[PDB]
Amino acid sequence: ITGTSTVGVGRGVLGDQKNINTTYSTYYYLQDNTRGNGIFTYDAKYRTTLPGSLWADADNQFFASYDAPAVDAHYYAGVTYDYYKNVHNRLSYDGNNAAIRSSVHYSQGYNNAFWNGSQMVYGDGDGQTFIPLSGGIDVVAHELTHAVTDYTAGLIYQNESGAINEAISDIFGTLVEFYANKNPDWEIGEDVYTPGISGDSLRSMSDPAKYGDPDHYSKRYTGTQDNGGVHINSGIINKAAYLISQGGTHYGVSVVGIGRDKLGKIFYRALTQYLTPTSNFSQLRAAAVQSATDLYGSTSQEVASVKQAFDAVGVK
């Protein structure tokens, strides 16, 4: 909408107060004009018709329980925009400052979030498996990263290319969580998963097998559920990325860690310059090796560590 840029204040899903960029024109709207061509947050009103209505508020204060998922979807989209711009010199998901759209209060008891080809969408959860999913910065960044992937490598959402698509979203979801630097970890979804159980998460990148996911190519899922295991076999790539950053010895293979920033540079370059829609795990290894070669040189520790990490997870 046309209006003037304003700054509201509210509380997110976990009860934390934050400022949010809004736009005033009769109402205060969840429209942040400070980033690209805007970040826009919508109310889906428990329905499945998208996007719903651009979020409108009478007083620019967002402290109602109903407001909390919108506050966080809006704010964390801004953090993720900042990560891509400041760290990778990428302007929004298309590289040309496309407007970023999110809807919250999607459906009833909806235990998930997604990128539908055009926008981000967040359920409220059923209060047992999840609380509103925009409360997790790694979830929000997972979603915006799907948009980045779709606009760049275009990884098809099945089998190995789809597991790479998933892992890329978990990797950059985690790197954004570290960028914001509030309780960062290598776990996925911990801030919104199972409010009645402490210390768990939906996936682990450091130990995928903790939640049943493979940590070696020899344990990959080969069936048809989950689009050929895209949320399962992502564990193999997530583990490789964790090892590149943090190091470790895994199935007897030692990896010298190179840190999160270099992991992010290598995988961002692989995603945007080398991967294609049908890339498989072996092709991801080659893309990561080449990306590290471009950035650090063929004889570098960074290249050697990429090779060690893929060796450790059985990907040649």
Tokens of 177: 């969580």
183 is in an annotated binding site: yes
Residue 23 or 165 having the CB closest to Zn ion: 165
Q: Which of 88, 143, 160, 302 is catalytic?
A: 143
Instruction: Write the binding mask 39 to 68 for Ca ion: x where contact by CB under 5 A, - elsewhere.
Output: ------------------x-x-x-------
Residue 167 or 312 having the CB closest to Zn ion: 167
Q: Which of 74, 88, 105, 231 is catalytic?
A: 231
Kindly state whether residue 145 participates in binding Zn ion, applying the rule CB under 5 A.
no
Instruction: Give the strand order in the sheet containing 4-11.
Output: 56-57, 27-29, 17-25, 4-11, 61-62
Residue 121 or 306 having the CB closest to Zn ion: 121
Kindly state whether residue 234 participates in binding Zn ion, applying the rule CB under 5 A.
no
Exposed (0-12), middle (13-18) or buried (19+): which is 85, by Cβ within 10 Å?
middle
**Which of 5, 34, 183, 282 is in the footprint of Ca ion by CB under 5 A?**
183
Kindly state whether residue 169 participates in binding Zn ion, applying the rule CB under 5 A.
yes
Distance in angstroms (rounded) separating the CA atoms of residues 170 and 100:
19
Looking only at the bridges linking them, the beta strands covering 100-106 and 17-25 are unpaired
Q: At its nearest, how many Å lie between ligand OZH and the CB of residue 21?
A: 24
Q: Could you confirm whether 143 is annotated as catalytic?
A: yes
Contact 110, 45 (CB under 8 A): no
197 is in an annotated binding site: yes
Distance in angstroms (rounded) separating the CA atoms of residues 139 and 190:
9
Instruction: Write the binding mask 138 to 157 for Ca ion: x where contact by CB under 5 A, - elsewhere.
Output: x-------------------
Question: What residue type is 200 in one-letter code?
Answer: D
Q: At its nearest, how many Å lie between ligand OZH and the CB of residue 143?
A: 6
**Site residues (vs ligand OZH, CB under 6 A):** 112-116, 133, 139, 142-143, 146, 157, 188-189, 202, 226, 231
Residue 189 or 208 having the CB closest to ligand OZH: 189
Residue burial 86-97, b: 16+ Cβ < 10 Å; e: rest: ebbebbbbeeeb
The two most distant CA atoms of the chain are separated, in Å, by 64
Cα torsion through 118, 124, 125, 127, rounded to 10? 170
Q: Could you confirm whether 105 is annotated as catalytic?
A: no
Distance in angstroms (rounded) separating the CA atoms of residues 80 and 43:
20
Distance in angstroms (rounded) separating the CA atoms of residues 287 and 274:
6
149 is in an annotated binding site: no
Residue 30 or 271 having the CB closest to Zn ion: 271
User: Which residues contribute to the site for Ca ion (CB under 5 A)?
Assistant: 57, 59, 61, 138, 177, 183, 185, 187, 193-194, 197, 200
Which residues are part of the catalytic machinery?
143, 231
User: Which residues contribute to the site for Zn ion (CB under 5 A)?
Assistant: 169
